[PDB]
Amino acid sequence: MRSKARARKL
Amino acid sequence: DDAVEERVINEEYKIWKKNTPFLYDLVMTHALEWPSLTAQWLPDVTRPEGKDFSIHRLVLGTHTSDEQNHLVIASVQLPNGKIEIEIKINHEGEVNRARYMPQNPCIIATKTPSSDVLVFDYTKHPSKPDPSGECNPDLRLRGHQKEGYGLSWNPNLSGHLLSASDDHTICLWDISAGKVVDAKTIFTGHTAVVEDVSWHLLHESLFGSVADDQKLMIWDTRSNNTSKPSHSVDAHTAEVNCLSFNPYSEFILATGSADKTVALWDLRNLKLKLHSFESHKDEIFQVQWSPHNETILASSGTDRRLNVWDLSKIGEEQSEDGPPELLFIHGGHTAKISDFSWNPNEPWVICSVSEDNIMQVWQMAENIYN
């Protein structure tokens, strides 16, 4: 079961 | 020790960046506004008369931290080179996975962080998405209790869609007759999170699934028993995250695992793994056969590498620096690779997307495979 990272904006 | 690895990653990328003129015939890098968890080339190519490039298109998505998400169609110009977004459609939560329907490639299924599987006809949504952020899918497909990633359209029966979920189930819908469609069938054979599902490319009744229970299961839709598959294989020593059927060899498929290996399988004798491809230093999340070359497959995951394998080199002598069947290591990404797609119209071109917003469209040098 994968753990998504917290996404950063560019 | 944490931000030491940051130095390791920065120095390896410096060496990789310096070596691209000998290792690649093409490298295009593009920073997306938000990262995509998903990537799939659309089937069409346009070659405008008297221009030095061709135009290809990709299905992408967003993964935001607490901002409006979108399903995305991008265009890519490839030489005989810009990357541009053509449409953004409002989507509820991040796009876990997006896949186009072979029989009508305007139709895109998506996996959301809720249990709904959504279906969009992308030509029925405005050019600009509405600032309100409202999601208006063309269908909502009900059946799951949790999110998932696995999604597969049947190439031999239009409108038949499979989906895998963290609820331990696989759902089947027949979308052909913003309404809600309940699952035609729910397959309950796995005892843990189902990570991936894929239809066989030739046999309309046949599909495979892989799960955190470490199993590869082979299912037949003609069976009245939805709690037990036709075959059940102890595939790996950890979670199995992906599978892919070989498009030229109807008995052959590949699975990728948190055990850091890709396994090669023959459907006729699933007691005996044919080969184990070893070189990844972490969990594998995607595996894909080349559309053009029967002995070629690729794999990616958490170690930030995309490996290309050539099965015909299994057993060759050396003298080592890697096994003989490892054709190429793509080291252009500096974060986890979430998905990748082989371009169906330009042999050896791959698009790969990672967690740090990077999209790369690339092609290894010709002398490496020829």
String of DSSP letters for B132-162 = T-----SEEEE--SS----EEE-TTSTTEEE
Q: Does any CB of chain B come closer than 8 Å to the CB of residue A1? A: yes
The reported resolution of this PDB entry, expressed in Å, is: 2.0
- Helix residue ranges per DSSP H, A1-10: none
B83 touches chain A (CB under 8 A): no
DSSP B169-232: -EEEEE----EEEE-SEEE---SS-EEEEEE-SS-TTEEEEEETTSEEEEEETT-S-SSS-SEE
Beta carbons of B52 and B80 less than 8 angstroms apart: yes
B245-280 CB burial, b ≥16 within 10 A, e <16: bbeeeeebbbbbbbbbbbbbbebeebeebebebebb
Tokens 């295009």 identify what position? B28
Q: How many CB atoms lie within 10 A of CB B342?
A: 21
Out of B31, B34, B239, closest to residue A7 by CB: B34
Task: Give the method used.
Answer: X-ray
Which tokens hold the place of B165?
């979920």
Contact B33 A9 (CB under 8 A): yes
Domains and CATH numbers, chain B: 1-370 (2.130.10.10)
User: DSSP readout, B72-131?
Assistant: EEEEEEEE---EEEEEEEEESS--SEEEEETTEEEEEEEE-SSS-EEEEEGGGS-SSPPT
State how far residue B141 is from chain A, nearest Cα, in angstroms. Answer: 22
Residue of B290, B278, B286, B291 lying closest to B306 (CA atoms): B286
Q: Quick one: DSSP state of residue B56?
A: E
- Sheet order of strands, B194-199 included: B194-199, B206-211, B215-220, B231-234
**Phi, psi at B283, each rounded to 5°:** -50, 135
Please give, rounded to a whole number of angstroms, the shortest distance from the CA of B111 to a CA of chain A.
Answer: 14
What residues contact B347, with CB distance under 8 A and at least 6 apart?
A: B290, B292, B293
Question: Which residue from A minimizes the CA distance to B66?
Answer: A7
CB within 8 Å: A4 and B166: no
Question: With an 8 Å Cβ cutoff, are B37 and A2 in contact?
Answer: no
CA dihedral B3, B8, B10, B11 (to 10 degrees): 150
Q: How far apart are alpha carbons B151 and B198 in whole angstroms?
A: 7
Q: Is there a contact between B236 and B255 (Cβ–Cβ < 8 Å)? A: yes
Measured between alpha carbons, how far is B194 from B152 in angstroms, rounded to an integer?
13
| β-strands B179-182, B139-142 pairing | parallel
| Contacts B335 to A, Cβ<8 Å | 5
Phi first, then psi: what are they for B315, rounded to 5°?
100, -15
Determine contact, residues B304/B337, Cβ cutoff 8 Å. Answer: yes
Beta B97-101 vs B104-111: how paired, if at all? antiparallel
Contact B355 A10 (CB under 8 A): no
What tokens does B164 get? 């895998």
